[PDB]
PDB file of C-alpha atoms and ligand atoms in Angstrom:
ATOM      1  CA  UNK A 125      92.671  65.334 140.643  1.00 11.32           C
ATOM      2  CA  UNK A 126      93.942  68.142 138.731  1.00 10.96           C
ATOM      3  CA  UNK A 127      96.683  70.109 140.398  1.00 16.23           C
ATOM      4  CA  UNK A 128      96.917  73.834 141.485  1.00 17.40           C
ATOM      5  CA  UNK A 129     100.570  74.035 141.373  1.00 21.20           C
ATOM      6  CA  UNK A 130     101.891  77.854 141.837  1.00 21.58           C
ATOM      7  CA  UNK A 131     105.074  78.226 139.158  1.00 20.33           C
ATOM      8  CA  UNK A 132     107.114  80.887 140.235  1.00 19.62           C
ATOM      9  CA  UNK A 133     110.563  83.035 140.019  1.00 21.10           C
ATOM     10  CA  UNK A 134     111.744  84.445 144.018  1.00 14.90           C
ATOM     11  CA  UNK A 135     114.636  85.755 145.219  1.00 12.67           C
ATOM     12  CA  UNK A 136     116.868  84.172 148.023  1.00 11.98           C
ATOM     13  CA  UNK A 137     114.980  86.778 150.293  1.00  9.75           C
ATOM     14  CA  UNK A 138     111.507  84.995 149.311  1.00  5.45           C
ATOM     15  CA  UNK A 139     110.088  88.289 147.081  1.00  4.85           C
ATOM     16  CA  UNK A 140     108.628  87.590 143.468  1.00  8.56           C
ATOM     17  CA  UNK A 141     108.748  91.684 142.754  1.00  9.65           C
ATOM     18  CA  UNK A 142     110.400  94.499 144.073  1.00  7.83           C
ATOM     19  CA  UNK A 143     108.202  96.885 146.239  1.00  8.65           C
ATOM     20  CA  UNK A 144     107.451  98.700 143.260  1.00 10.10           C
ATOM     21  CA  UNK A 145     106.285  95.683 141.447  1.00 11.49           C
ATOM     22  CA  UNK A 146     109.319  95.593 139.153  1.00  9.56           C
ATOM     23  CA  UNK A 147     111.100  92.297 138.166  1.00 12.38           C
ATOM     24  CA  UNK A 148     114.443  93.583 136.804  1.00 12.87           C
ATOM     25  CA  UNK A 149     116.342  91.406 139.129  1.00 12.29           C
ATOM     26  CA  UNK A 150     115.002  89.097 136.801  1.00 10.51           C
ATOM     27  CA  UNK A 151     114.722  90.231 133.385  1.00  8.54           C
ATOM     28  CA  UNK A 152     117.939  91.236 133.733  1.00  5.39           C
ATOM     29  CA  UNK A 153     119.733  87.932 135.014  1.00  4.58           C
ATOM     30  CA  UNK A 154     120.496  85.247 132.224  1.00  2.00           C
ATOM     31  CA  UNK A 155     118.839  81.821 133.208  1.00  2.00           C
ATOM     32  CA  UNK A 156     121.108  79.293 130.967  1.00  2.07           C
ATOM     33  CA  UNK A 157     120.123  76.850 128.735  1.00  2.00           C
ATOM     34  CA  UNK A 158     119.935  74.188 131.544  1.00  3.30           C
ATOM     35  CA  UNK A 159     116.970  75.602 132.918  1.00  2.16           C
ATOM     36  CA  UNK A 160     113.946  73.114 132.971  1.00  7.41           C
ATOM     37  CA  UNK A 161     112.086  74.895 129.038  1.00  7.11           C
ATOM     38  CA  UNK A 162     108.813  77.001 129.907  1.00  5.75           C
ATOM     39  CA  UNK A 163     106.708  75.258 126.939  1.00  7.67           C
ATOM     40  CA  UNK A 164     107.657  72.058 128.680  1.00  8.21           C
ATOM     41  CA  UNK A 165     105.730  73.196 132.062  1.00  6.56           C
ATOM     42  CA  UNK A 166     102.796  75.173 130.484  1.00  7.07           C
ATOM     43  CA  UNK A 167     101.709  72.431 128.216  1.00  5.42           C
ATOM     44  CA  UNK A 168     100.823  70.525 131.411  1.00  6.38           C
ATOM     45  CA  UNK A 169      98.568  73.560 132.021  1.00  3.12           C
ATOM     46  CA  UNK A 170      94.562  73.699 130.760  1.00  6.70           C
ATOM     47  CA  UNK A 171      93.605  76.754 133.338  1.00  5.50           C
ATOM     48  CA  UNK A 172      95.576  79.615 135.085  1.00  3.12           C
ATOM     49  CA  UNK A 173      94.129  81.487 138.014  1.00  4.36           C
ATOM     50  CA  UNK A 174      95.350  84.550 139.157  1.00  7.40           C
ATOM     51  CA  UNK A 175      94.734  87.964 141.172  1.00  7.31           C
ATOM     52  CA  UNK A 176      93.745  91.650 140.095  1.00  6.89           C
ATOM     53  CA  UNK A 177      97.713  92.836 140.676  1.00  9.01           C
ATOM     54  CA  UNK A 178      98.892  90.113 138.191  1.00  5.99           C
ATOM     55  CA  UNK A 179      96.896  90.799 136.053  1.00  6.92           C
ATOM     56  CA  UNK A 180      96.941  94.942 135.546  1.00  6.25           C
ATOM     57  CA  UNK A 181     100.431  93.883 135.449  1.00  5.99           C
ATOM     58  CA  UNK A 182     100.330  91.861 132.420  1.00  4.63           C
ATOM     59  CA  UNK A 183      97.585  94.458 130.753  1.00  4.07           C
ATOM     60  CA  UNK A 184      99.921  97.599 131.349  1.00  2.23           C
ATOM     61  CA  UNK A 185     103.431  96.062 130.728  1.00  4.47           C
ATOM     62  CA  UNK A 186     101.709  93.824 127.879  1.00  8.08           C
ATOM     63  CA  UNK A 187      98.848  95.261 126.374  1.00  6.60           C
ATOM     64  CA  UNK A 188      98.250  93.533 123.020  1.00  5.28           C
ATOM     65  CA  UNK A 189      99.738  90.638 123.741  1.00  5.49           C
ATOM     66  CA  UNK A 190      97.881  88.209 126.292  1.00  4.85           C
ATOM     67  CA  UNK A 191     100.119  85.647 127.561  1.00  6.55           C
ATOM     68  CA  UNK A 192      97.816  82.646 128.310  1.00  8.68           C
ATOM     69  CA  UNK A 193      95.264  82.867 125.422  1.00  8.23           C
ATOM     70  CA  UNK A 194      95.436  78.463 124.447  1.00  4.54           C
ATOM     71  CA  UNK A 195      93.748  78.860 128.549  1.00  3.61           C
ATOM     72  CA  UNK A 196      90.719  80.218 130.183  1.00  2.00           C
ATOM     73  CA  UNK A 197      91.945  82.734 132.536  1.00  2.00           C
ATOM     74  CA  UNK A 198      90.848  83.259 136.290  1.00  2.91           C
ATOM     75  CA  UNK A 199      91.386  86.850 137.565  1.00  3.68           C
ATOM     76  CA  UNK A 200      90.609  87.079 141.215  1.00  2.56           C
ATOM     77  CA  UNK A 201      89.137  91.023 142.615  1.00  3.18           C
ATOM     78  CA  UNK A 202      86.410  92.423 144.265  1.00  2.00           C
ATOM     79  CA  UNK A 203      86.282  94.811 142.031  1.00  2.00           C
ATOM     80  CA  UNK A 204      84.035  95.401 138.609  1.00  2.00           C
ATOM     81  CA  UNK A 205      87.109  94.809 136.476  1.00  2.00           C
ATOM     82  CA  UNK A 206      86.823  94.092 132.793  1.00  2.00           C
ATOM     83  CA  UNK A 207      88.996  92.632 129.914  1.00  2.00           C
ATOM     84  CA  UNK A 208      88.975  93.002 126.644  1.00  2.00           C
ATOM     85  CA  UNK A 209      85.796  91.349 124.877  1.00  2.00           C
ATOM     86  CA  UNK A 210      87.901  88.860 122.838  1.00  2.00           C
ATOM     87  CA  UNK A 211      90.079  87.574 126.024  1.00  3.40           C
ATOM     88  CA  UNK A 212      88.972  84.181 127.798  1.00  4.19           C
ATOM     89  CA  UNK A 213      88.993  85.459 131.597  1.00  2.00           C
ATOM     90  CA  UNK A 214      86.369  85.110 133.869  1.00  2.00           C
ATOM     91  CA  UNK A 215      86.088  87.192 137.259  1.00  3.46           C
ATOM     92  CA  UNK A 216      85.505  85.278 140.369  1.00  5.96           C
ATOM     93  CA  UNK A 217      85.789  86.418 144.758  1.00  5.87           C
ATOM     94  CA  UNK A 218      85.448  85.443 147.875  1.00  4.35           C
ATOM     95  CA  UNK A 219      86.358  81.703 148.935  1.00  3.01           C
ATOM     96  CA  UNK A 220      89.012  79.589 146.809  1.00  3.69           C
ATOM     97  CA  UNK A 221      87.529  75.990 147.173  1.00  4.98           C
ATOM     98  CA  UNK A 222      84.651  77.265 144.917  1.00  2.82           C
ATOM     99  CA  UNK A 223      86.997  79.371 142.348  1.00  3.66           C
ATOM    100  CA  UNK A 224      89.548  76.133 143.023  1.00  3.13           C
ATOM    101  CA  UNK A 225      86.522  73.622 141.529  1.00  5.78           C
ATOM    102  CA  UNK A 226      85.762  75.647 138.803  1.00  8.06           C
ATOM    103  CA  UNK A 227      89.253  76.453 137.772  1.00 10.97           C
ATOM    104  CA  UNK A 228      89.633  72.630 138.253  1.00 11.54           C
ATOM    105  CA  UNK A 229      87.167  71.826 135.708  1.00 10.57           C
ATOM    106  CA  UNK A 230      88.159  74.427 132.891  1.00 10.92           C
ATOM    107  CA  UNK A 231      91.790  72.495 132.983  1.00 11.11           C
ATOM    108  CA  UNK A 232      90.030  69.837 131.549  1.00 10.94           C
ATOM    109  CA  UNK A 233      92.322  67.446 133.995  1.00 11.07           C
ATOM    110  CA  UNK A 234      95.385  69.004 133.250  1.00 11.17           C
ATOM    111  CA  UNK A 235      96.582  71.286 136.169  1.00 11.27           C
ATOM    112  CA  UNK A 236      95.284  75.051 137.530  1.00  6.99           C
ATOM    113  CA  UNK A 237      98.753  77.187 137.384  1.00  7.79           C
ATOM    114  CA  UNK A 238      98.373  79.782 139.859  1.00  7.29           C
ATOM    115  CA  UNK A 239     100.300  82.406 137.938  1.00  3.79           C
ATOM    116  CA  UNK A 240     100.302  84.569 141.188  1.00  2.85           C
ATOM    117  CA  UNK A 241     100.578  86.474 142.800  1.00  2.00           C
ATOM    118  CA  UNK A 242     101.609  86.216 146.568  1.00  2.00           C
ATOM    119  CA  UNK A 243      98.779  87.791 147.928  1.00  2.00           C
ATOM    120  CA  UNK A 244      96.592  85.201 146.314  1.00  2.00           C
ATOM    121  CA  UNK A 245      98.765  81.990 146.164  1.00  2.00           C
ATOM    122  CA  UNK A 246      98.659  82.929 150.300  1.00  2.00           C
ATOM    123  CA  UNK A 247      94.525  82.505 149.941  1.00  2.00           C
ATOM    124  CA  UNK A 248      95.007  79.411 148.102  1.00  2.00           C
ATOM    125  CA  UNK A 249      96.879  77.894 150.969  1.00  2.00           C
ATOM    126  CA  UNK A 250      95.141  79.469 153.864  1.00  2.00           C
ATOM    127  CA  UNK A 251      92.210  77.382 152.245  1.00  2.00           C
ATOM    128  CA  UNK A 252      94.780  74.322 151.919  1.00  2.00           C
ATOM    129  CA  UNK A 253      93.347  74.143 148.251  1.00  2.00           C
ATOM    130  CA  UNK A 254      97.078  75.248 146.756  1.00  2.00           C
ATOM    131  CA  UNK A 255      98.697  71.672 146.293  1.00  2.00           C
ATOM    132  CA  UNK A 256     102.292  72.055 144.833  1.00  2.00           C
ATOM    133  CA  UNK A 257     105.388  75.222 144.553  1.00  2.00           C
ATOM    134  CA  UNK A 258     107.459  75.063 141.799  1.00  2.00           C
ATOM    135  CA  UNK A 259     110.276  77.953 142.334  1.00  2.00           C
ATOM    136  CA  UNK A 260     113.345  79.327 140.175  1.00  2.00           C
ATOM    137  CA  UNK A 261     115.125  81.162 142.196  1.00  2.00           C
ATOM    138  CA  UNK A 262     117.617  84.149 141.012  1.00  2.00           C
ATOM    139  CA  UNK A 263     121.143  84.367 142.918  1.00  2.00           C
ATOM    140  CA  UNK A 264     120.145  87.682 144.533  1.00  2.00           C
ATOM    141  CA  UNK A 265     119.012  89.461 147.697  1.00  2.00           C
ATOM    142  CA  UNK A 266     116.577  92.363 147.339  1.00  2.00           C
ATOM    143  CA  UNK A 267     115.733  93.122 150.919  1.00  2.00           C
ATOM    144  CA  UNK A 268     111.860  93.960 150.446  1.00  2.00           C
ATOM    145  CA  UNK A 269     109.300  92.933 148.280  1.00  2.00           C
ATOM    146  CA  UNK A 270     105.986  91.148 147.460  1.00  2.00           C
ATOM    147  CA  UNK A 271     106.175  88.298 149.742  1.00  2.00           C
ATOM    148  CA  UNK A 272     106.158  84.777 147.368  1.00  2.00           C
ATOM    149  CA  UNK A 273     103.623  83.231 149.591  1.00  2.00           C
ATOM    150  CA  UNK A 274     102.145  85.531 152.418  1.00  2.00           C
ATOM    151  CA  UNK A 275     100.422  82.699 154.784  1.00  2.00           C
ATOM    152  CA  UNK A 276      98.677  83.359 158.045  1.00  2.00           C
ATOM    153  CA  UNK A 277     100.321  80.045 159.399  1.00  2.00           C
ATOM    154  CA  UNK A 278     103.320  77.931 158.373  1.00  2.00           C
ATOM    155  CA  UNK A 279     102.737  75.602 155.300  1.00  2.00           C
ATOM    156  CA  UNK A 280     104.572  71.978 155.727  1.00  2.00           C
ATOM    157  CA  UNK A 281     106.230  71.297 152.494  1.00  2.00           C
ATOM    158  CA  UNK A 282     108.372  67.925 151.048  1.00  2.00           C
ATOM    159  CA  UNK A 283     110.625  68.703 148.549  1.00  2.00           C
ATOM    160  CA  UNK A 284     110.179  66.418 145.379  1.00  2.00           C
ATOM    161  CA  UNK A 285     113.127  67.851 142.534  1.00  2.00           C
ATOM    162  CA  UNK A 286     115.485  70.128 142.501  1.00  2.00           C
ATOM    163  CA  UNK A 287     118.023  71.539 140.146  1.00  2.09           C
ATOM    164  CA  UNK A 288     120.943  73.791 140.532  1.00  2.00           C
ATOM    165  CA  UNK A 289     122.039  75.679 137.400  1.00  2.00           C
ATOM    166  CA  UNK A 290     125.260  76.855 135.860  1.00  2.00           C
ATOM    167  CA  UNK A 291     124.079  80.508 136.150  1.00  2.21           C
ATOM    168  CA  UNK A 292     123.672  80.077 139.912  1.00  2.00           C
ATOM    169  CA  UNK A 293     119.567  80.382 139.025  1.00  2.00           C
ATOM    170  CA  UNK A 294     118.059  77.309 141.137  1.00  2.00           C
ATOM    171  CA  UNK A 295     114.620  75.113 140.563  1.00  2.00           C
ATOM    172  CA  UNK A 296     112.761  72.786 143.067  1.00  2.00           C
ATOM    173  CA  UNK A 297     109.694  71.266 143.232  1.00  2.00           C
ATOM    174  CA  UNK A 298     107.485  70.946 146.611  1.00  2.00           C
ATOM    175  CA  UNK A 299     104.597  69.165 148.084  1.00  2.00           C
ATOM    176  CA  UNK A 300     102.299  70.645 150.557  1.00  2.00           C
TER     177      UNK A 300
HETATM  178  N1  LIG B 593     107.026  85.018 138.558  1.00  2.00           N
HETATM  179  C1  LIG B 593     106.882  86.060 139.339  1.00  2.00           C
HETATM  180  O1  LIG B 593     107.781  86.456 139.980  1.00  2.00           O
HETATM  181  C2  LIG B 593     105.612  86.791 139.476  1.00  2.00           C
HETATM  182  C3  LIG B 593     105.606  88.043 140.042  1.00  2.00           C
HETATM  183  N2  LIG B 593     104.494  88.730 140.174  1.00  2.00           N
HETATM  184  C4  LIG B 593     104.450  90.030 140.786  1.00  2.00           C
HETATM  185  O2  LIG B 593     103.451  89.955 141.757  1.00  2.00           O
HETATM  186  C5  LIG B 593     102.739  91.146 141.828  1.00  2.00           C
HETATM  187  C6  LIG B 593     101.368  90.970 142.424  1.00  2.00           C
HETATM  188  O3  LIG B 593     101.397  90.155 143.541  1.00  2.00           O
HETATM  189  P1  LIG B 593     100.504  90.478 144.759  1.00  2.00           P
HETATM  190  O4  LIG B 593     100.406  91.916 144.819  1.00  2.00           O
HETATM  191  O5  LIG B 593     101.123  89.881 145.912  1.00  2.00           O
HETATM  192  O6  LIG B 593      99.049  89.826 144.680  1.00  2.00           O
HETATM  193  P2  LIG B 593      98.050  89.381 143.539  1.00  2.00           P
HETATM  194  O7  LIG B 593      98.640  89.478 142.236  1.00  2.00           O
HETATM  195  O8  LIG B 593      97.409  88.143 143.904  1.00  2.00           O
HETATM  196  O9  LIG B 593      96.903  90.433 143.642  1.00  2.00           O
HETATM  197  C7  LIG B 593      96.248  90.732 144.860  1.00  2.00           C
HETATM  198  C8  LIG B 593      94.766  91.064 144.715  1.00  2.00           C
HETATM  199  O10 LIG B 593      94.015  89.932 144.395  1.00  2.00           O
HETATM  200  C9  LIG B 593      92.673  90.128 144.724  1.00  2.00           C
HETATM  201  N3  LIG B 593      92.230  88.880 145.366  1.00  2.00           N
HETATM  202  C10 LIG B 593      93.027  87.938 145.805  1.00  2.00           C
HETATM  203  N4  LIG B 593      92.339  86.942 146.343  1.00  2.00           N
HETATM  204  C11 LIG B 593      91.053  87.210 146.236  1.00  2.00           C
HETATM  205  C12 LIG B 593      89.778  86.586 146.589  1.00  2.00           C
HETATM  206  N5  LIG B 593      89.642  85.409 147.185  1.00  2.00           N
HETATM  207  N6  LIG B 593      88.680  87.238 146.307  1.00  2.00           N
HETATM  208  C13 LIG B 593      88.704  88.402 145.728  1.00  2.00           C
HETATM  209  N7  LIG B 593      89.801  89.023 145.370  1.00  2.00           N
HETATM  210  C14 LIG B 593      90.996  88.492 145.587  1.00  2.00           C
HETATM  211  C15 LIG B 593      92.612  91.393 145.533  1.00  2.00           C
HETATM  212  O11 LIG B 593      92.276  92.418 144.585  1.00  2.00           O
HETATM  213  P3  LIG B 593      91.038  93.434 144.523  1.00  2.00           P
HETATM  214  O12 LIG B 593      91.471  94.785 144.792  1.00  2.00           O
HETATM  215  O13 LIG B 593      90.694  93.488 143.127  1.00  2.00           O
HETATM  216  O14 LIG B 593      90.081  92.878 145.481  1.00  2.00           O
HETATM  217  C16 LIG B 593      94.048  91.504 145.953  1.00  2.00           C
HETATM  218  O15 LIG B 593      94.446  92.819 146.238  1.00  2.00           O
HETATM  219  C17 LIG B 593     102.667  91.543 140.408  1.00  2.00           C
HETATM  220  O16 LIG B 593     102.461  92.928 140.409  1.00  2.00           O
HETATM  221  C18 LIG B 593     103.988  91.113 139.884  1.00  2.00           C
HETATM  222  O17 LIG B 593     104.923  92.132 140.105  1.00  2.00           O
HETATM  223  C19 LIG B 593     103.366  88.203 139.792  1.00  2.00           C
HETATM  224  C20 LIG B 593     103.256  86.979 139.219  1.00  2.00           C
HETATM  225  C21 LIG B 593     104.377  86.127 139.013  1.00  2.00           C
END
């Protein structure tokens, strides 16, 4: 009822970071006004889900300053991670139909936004529990990288919108 939709930047070689983990290619490239407004997707959002590289990510790149903190957070290890003692996260493992209903829930019937990253959006759909992609994609090849979406099989998908932008950035929408 409530949607796990994975929202997303890749490259035109399919990678959401560089091997290292770094998003320059990114941070570095100017969207354009054009592009469908971040506030306008997240408000559709009540939970976000995500795994235990995301997440260190976000911790050492942005310490004191959580990004989702309107949300309860999901952070996906199997590990004895902690966060701080005033964040909303809750640490969950093993199969994603069970983390999927419970993320489900805490969304309150808004949608799950599986903030990433590959590695996990991959369990998702192995599990055929991730439902919608939405992608922006940057006008740039980096040759090697965290894979966007690392199934074991291939994943049937219907494309539903998609935008082309003045900056040569690129949005679409898909259905699995
Ligand atoms: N917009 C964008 O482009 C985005 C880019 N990124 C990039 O993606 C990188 C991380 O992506 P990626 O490395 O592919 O993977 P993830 O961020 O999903 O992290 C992978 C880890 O998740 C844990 N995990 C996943 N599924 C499960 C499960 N069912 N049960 C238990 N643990 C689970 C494991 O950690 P454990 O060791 O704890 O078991 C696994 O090693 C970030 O570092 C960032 O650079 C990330 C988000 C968005």
């Amino acid at each position: 009822m409530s949607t796990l939709v994975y929202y997303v930047a890749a490259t035109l070689d399919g990678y959401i970071a560089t091997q290292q983990h770094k998003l320059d290619w990114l941070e570095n490239f100017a969207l354009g006004d054009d592009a469908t407004a971040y506030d306008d997707f997240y408000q559709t959002i009540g939970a976000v889900v995500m795994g235990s590289q995301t997440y260190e990510w976000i911790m050492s790149n942005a310490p004191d300053d959580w990004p989702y903190q309107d949300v309860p957070a999901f952070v996906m290890s199997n590990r004895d991670l902690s966060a701080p003692a005033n964040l909303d996260i809750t640490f969950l493992r093993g199969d994603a139909s069970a983390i999927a209903v419970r993320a489900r829930q805490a969304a309150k019937g808004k949608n799950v936004w599986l903030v990433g990253g590959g590695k996990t959006a991959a369990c998702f759909a192995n599990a055929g529990e991730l439902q919608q992609l939405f992608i922006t994609t940057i006008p740039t090849f980096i040759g090697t990288g965290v894979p966007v979406l690392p199934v074991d099989r291939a994943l049937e998908v219907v494309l539903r919108e998609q935008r082309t932008l003045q900056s040569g950035a690129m949005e679409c929408i898909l259905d699995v």
